[PDB]
Write a protein that binds this ligand. Structure first.
Ligand SMILES: C[C@@H]1CC[C@@]2(OC1)O[C@H]1[C@@H](O)[C@H]3[C@@H]4CC[C@H]5C[C@@H](O[C@@H]6O[C@H](CO)[C@H](O[C@@H]7O[C@H](CO)[C@@H](O)[C@H](O[C@@H]8OC[C@@H](O)[C@H](O)[C@H]8O)[C@H]7O[C@@H]7O[C@H](CO)[C@H](O)[C@H](O[C@@H]8O[C@H](CO)[C@@H](O)[C@H](O)[C@H]8O)[C@H]7O)[C@H](O)[C@H]6O)[C@H](O)C[C@]5(C)[C@H]4CC[C@]3(C)[C@H]1[C@@H]2C
Ligand code: CLA
Ligand code: CLA
Ligand code: CLA
Ligand code: CLA
Ligand code: CLA
Ligand SMILES: CCCCCCCCCCCCCCCCCC(=O)OC[C@H](CO[C@@H]1O[C@H](CO)[C@H](O)[C@H](O)[C@H]1O)OC(=O)CCCCCCCCCCCCCCCCC
Ligand SMILES: CC1=C(/C=C/C(C)=C/C=C/C(C)=C/C=C/C=C(C)/C=C/C=C(C)/C=C/C2=C(C)CCCC2(C)C)C(C)(C)CCC1
Ligand SMILES: CC1=C(/C=C/C(C)=C/C=C/C(C)=C/C=C/C=C(C)/C=C/C=C(C)/C=C/C2=C(C)CCCC2(C)C)C(C)(C)CCC1
Ligand SMILES: CC1=C(/C=C/C(C)=C\C=C\C(C)=C\C=C\C=C(C)\C=C\C=C(C)\C=C\C2=C(C)CCCC2(C)C)C(C)(C)CCC1
Ligand code: SF4
Ligand code: SF4
Lengths: 80, 134, 33, 167, 154
């Protein structure tokens, strides 16, 4: 449905993965020798576009972005 | 899925016709003490002494409930996805470690090595099926 | 000649909407188009 | 002290008996069993209505449904419609009432052709209602609504117009 | 411009030819969605809609052109005469139904098998509905024409 893109400016705050209500994000180890970790977006079907992660990321401009796209039952948050 | 349902009289807010037809969810957790906890949708309920189970409409309700369980110091919250055919999948944690703590088995996905400002202009990728963020 | 208005007004207000909405509703609810 | 204060906790108190229950045994479900929803009186009435009555054909259901509505819809057009004070007042009600039945039957067959999802089950009607889960059942229901609706309106027209002769 | 007429299907061996009248977009919809071919209907509903169309059609010739057309009971003759013709039409169906009718054919305009007219039951249920709808269509046409002056008089 949506597309959550994670850019190079991450620093491993782990704030995005916590703020996500639907657990769309995950912190994975980066192949960078001195880079501790980096975020990920493995289960993007469950994104609900609430943009909490964009509010959490403390970079000058956000390392993470949520681009709106094709909607569905899960993305629109319809229990019915 | 094995567990005792929390004791509550019932509520208008809860499972709907979507549950039978489309992907009802279920959350599982084990409690040390029987305590009163607010339900995800209206009201209060009493969790049992061990192996509680609750059927849930959306995945958001389960994780929202898990944050409340952490106030009671219950961190073993498990969520499943129940299709109409009965297929149950260990959905929320794919591996035993939580999403916050790093694990070697995971792999980065949808990672853009460029900076956000280095994205191309949309005029460069018009009439191609490509998107700027990709 | 004034009898034309007695036949053209109602079909515009009733027949044309019923035909358009009925076709459009079945068209949008179709599974394969 | 009064005994009413002491008995508030006991289950023998008429207070503590609870009328409301969860839908079925599962409390997670949406509905709540209430005396309006789950009483034997209401369950008997709703389940035995033509839309839910057991062992009836789809054509028989719409005829019973249409004959009621046709007989009902004659009233508003006659007494309160235009030309209510005139010799042809009752006649205008017969045409206007049949007009809705045609529009109503159109919506039925129109809703029928669009694949209807399902007929839902609730506390008042636990079983699935009928074979209203297909185009064939809804289409026969529509044709029956038309016949009964035209007949019911004629009946109300005959009785209402010839009421003085009946007196 | 190029050819408009094609063979039925891919095979040219078969008789039928694809033509505008046979295989146009408009004609295929009308014929296939007529009650005799419309999908999702039972045999009873098909006969009802067919009869209802025919009773309304057959009332006219008897009334405005039959004997006593220039009389007070003109419109009444059309209703009774049409019903007698509908009954014969109903009787014909029962004979064609009760004589083991072979099959229904599939042409280019109706490519799929047309309907469940492949048995005695489908035709018999068709006949019962023809009489019900057939008599109804004539009774409707009688009350309108007889009371058309009133309906305009309103
Ligand atoms: C103007 C009036 C006055 C009188 C009346 O007509 C209209 O005639 C009535 C009639 O006969 C009805 C009774 C018939 C019998 C009925 C019996 C029914 O009992 C049932 O109970 C169940 C137990 O699980 C089963 O499920 C079930 O399947 C079942 O049937 C109960 O649910 C209500 C019911 C007792 C009735 C309620 C309403 C009535 C009294 C109707 C009614 C008010
Ligand atoms: C634009 C087209 C259009 C036309 C031509 C009409 C025409 C009419 N409307 Mg109407 N209407 C329209 C749009 C239209 N409406 C819209 C958009 C709305 C929504 C706001 C309404 C809301 C509306 C109301 C709320 C009412 C009308 C009524 C009427 C009738 C009143 C005539 C009169 O003076 O007294 C009556 C004069 C008569 C000669 C008796 C009329 C008898 C009816 C019209 C016979 C109809 C038979 C019908 C064709 C059967 C249908 C079946 C068929 C499809 C097979 C008249 C026929 C009034 C009414 O009661 O009509 C009965 C009325 O109460 N209309
Ligand atoms: C295109 C603009 C236009 C508009 C807005 C109207 C508006 C009207 N016409 Mg009209 N008319 C038009 C063009 C138009 N006419 C043309 C070009 C002709 C010659 C063929 C006529 C011939 C005509 C007659 C003979 C009558 C009307 C009548 C009427 C009135 C009743 C409702 C109606 O449309 O009847 C229905 C009218 C038609 C079906 C003819 C319209 C044909 C045009 C070409 C279609 C326009 C397509 C449109 C842009 C699609 C947009 C969606 C209404 C005031 C009636 C009247 O006087 O009532 C008081 C009436 O009896 N019209
Ligand atoms: C605004 C809506 C409306 C109107 C105008 C009417 C008008 C009429 N109805 Mg009626 N009805 C209605 C709604 C309406 N009803 C509803 C909602 C229902 C279903 C609950 C019915 C069920 C019904 C039946 C079963 C019968 C009628 C009959 C009649 C006619 C009585 C004869 C007459 O002319 O006496 C003069 C009329 C009046 C001075 C005014 C109306 C008086 C009637 C008796 C009112 C009855 C309806 C009732 C009070 C509605 C409340 C229901 C609610 C508690 C659920 C009259 C034309 C009878 C009939 O066919 O006539 C021969 C008949 O047998 N109606
Ligand atoms: C010689 C043959 C004949 C005759 C005498 C009539 C005579 C009549 N037709 Mg008619 N009609 C005919 C052939 C005929 N039609 C054919 C061949 C068709 C189909 C192509 C129709 C379709 C038809 C319709 C749809 C309607 C009439 C109506 C009427 C009546 C007008 C009032 C009148 C009795 C109208 C009617 O019933 O009057 C209210 C009407 O609504 N006819
Ligand atoms: C074949 C030519 C022919 C024609 C046209 C007529 C015409 C007529 N005869 Mg007659 N007659 C004929 C030969 C003919 N006769 C012969 C050969 C004899 C000697 C046996 C008689 C003996 C005779 C008698 C003794 C009487 C008549 C009477 C009548 C009249 C009433 C018809 C009636 O009720 O039928 C009803 C007809 C139908 C129910 C069917 C109509 C079929 C329609 C028109 C089909 C239309 C098809 C449509 C256009 C196509 C659809 C296309 C689709 C894609 C939309 C009418 C003027 C009566 C009368 O009094 O005359 C005034 C009368 O009593 N006739
Ligand atoms: C009859 C008038 C329409 C007509 O000419 O044929 C209708 C044909 C349509 O011809 C089209 O030709 C196309 C060629 O690629 C394709 O073959 C289409 O299938 C064919 O329909 O019109 C013409 O092609 C020529 C029209 C010239 C008309 C000039 C009008 C001047 C006034
Ligand atoms: C008390 C009560 C109530 C009330 C009730 C009511 C008010 C009822 C209704 C009423 C109605 C609503 C009625 C109606 C009836 C009707 C009728 C009576 C009909 C008739 C019909 C006929 C008879 C027809 C026939 C025909 C046909 C079908 C076709 C052809 C033609 C003819 C005409 C033959 C209720 C339930 C709410 C609730 C509970 C209690
Ligand atoms: C344009 C065109 C066309 C034309 C058309 C036409 C011409 C039409 C026809 C017409 C017709 C042909 C019509 C008819 C109709 C009918 C009706 C309208 C019916 C009615 C019915 C009823 C309503 C009934 C009911 C009932 C019953 C059933 C039983 C009991 C009684 C009663 C009455 C209730 C065509 C297609 C050719 C071709 C193309 C184009
Ligand atoms: C549309 C169509 C078509 C076509 C058709 C046409 C075009 C025509 C037809 C035609 C016809 C098919 C005709 C018929 C006619 C008939 C007649 C002409 C008859 C008459 C009769 C009479 C006149 C008699 C009377 C009576 C009765 C009924 C009973 C009692 C006694 C009396 C004698 C009274 C087809 C098939 C392809 C297909 C389907 C669709
Ligand atoms: S910069 Fe944003 S995406 Fe990267 S670790 Fe911090 S909060 Fe997560
Ligand atoms: S919009 Fe943001 S907070 Fe919401 S699911 Fe997507 S990434 Fe997580």
């Amino acid at each position: 449905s949506h597309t959550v893109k994670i850019y190079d400016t991450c620093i491993g705050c782990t704030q995005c993965v916590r703020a996500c209500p639907t657990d769309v994000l995950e912190m994975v180890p980066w192949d960078g020798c001195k880079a501790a970790q980096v975020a990920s977006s493995p289960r993007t079907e469950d994104c609900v576009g609430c943009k909490r992660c964009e509010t959490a990321c403390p970079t000058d401009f956000l390392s993470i972005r949520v681009y709106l796209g094709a909607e569905t039952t899960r993305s629109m948050g319809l229990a019915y | 899925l094995s567990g005792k349902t929390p004791l509550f009289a019932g509520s208008t807010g809860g499972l709907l016709t979507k549950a039978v037809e489309e992907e009802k969810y279920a959350i599982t957790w084990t409690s040390p003490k029987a305590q009163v906890f607010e339900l995800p949708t209206g009201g209060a309920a009493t969790m049992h002494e061990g192996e509680n189970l609750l059927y849930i409409a959306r995945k958001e309700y389960g994780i929202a409930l898990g944050g409340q369980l952490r106030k009671f110091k219950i961190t073993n919250y498990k969520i499943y996805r129940i299709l109409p055919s009965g297929e149950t999948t260990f959905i929320h944690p794919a591996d035993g470690v939580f999403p916050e703590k790093v694990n070697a088995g995971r792999e980065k996905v949808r990672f853009n090595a460029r900076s956000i400002g280095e994205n191309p202009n949309p005029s460069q990728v018009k009439f191609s099926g490509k998107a700027t963020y990709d | 000649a004034s009898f034309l208005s007695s036949i053209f007004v109602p079909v515009i207000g009733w027949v044309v909407p019923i035909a358009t909405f009925s076709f459009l509703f079945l068209y949008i609810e179709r599974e394969d188009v | 002290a009064q005994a009413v204060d002491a008995s508030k906790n006991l289950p023998s108190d008429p207070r503590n008996r609870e009328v409301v229950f969860p839908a079925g045994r599962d409390p997670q479900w949406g509905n709540l069993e209430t005396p309006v929803n789950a009483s034997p009186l209401v369950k008997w009435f709703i389940n035995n209505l033509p839309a839910y009555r057991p062992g009836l054909t789809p054509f028989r259901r719409g005829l019973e449904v249409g004959m009621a509505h046709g007989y009902f819809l004659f009233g508003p057009f006659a007494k309160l419609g235009p030309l209510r004070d005139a010799a042809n007042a009752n006649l205008a009600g017969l045409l206007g009432a049949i007009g809705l039945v045609v529009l109503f039957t159109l919506a039925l067959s129109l809703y029928a052709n669009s694949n209807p999802p399902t007929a839902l089950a609730s506390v008042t009607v636990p079983n699935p209602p009928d074979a209203f889960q297909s185009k064939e059942g809804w289409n026969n229901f529509a044709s029956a609504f038309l016949i009964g609706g035209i007949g019911g309106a004629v009946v109300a027209y005959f009785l209402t117009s010839n009421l003085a002769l009946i007196q």
